[PDB]
Amino acid sequence: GPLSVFGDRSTGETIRSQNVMAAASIANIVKSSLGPVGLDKMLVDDIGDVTITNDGATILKLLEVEHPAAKVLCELADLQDKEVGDGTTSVVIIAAELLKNADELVKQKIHPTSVISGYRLACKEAVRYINENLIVNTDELGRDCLINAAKTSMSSKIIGINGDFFANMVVDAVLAIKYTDIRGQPRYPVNSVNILKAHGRSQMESMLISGYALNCVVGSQGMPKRIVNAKIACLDFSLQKTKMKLGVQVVITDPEKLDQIRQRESDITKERIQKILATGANVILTTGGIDDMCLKYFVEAGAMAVRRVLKRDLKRIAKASGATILSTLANLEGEETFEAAMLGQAEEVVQERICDDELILIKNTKARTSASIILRGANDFMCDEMERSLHDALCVVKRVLESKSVVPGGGAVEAALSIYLENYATSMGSREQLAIAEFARSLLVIPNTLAVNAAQDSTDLVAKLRAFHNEAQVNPERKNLKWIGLDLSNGKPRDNKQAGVFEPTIVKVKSLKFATEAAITILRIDDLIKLHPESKD
């Protein structure tokens, strides 16, 4: 008679109501961590680890989910870090409210393919309207655009101070790693900034190290820990005793030739260490291993040798100091040449005190003048929060300098799109106009969440918010009310042009493209079959 599957089958409006409650179970979590009045959470594990964070990606990655519609919204937050980097609480609330308003349409016996086709006409029109209603590029504002866009990202986190201490350190970090490319591409690789953590003084003592901050120790306590006018030798091979390979064995037939082979394992080893040290090299960085026999040659000659450094840290030092990453001997059948003209340069390599640990600093690197940020917090829970908040702040200034276009934040984009799409649904709307009209109400949840978390008036402040944006579209008298946002500290609509509340363009363009595409896949689960777990057979 029925289906003889050994799992479970649920059809109809059961799964159509379960996917909305699965998406609302995720959105109601992250609704309390949006905007400058948002608050952080606690993520306690079974082993006892506590993670205090408010970013939309760190919470949903550590949180376990079971529903298939819940894994779509959790993987939607992971894509926002790679594509944009701060846009990762706002996408989850929009994509869940896109399913909440579309559930009210399919309960009115409206076909979901008209809602899918109605959402594509509203998503492509939202990108078209936001690209024709921008204020200015990065020429008029200058450095004031980079600082004000950085403070908007920090307002939802622990580094949202009233001053410009953390804002100036981010702009000075991205501007110091300007790496040009072919065909006129000024790239800004923000992954080259080594963000370090140390439980020390307050947040106002966060050092901006112009150069690189290596997270390693010297090793042997007989080397000079401060070298002025240093020459960095970046190399990746273990400075240990000469061990033969698997194909080579030592089969001796004469007992007199025994001790000459035993001394040869250290003579070939020390032959490399004397030709890399006679060329003026004082700092040697190694990703392999330097044993206790080879540490004597640096104490005797007065050189610094750092062992077991990361491979991702050696590439950031050799590119910034002009050093060449050498793995072995080379240069056309040469015995030991080392190409001594390709040594790195540094002004000062100094191991400072980082509150009961050792940290090596390189000052200005003499070639590229890179930057590294050492964070200072109260405990380890604040340092993990300060690292995530700084990494999201580095991604904001990266997209502004690459794509010179900013949009007003604080719900100013979602207020203008809530009224333009209602007029867009009336012109060319015959049967898909109800999906475009619900696309505007789903976008209004971003200024609605700012009024809930601020404990302000909800149905009056957003009603006063769209009152200025309606007069900016139907009354062409140059009212300039396209930048009207929210003042959550006062509870009144303010102008985000003069207040300095700036967000990048692709933090909302890619947010509206990812949330609309995720809402289509969850809208097509009218039939769902769940099989039994095959564990013990």
Binding site: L79, K82, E83, I182, T242, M244, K245, G247, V248, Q249, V250, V251, I252, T253, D254, K257, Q260, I261, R264, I268, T328, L329, L332, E333, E335, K513, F514, E517
Partner: protein
């Protein structure tokens, strides 16, 4: 077309990568590989000549069991320096091809 009535779909490779939207799909007629570049210091070359090599550029070894007998002081120098001269003749054979 107009020469054969069969078509193999195994000549059309489909690469699945997470990121972007469906409008970011591409119809590149060349080769798309998912492997990384070691070393990644260049990652771009125009007027490139591509060569497929099935030889292993490493230490000399045979299908039979091969061992190195070291019974002299200078014999350890003749193992490391001849292995560097072996693969240098393999790289210079590759480099002089173009």
């Amino acid at each position: 077309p107009a020469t054969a009535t069969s078509v193999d779909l195994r000549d059309i490779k489909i690469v699945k990568k997470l990121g972007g939207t469906i409008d970011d799909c591409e119809l590149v007629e060349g080769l798309v590989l998912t492997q990384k570049v070691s070393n990644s210091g260049i990652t771009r070359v125009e007027k490139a000549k591509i060569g497929l090599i099935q030889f292993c550029l490493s230490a000399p070894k045979t299908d039979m069991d091969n061992q190195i007998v070291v019974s002299d002081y200078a014999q350890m120098d003749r193992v490391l320096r001849e292995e560097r001269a072996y693969i240098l003749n393999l790289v210079k054979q590759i480099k002089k091809t173009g």
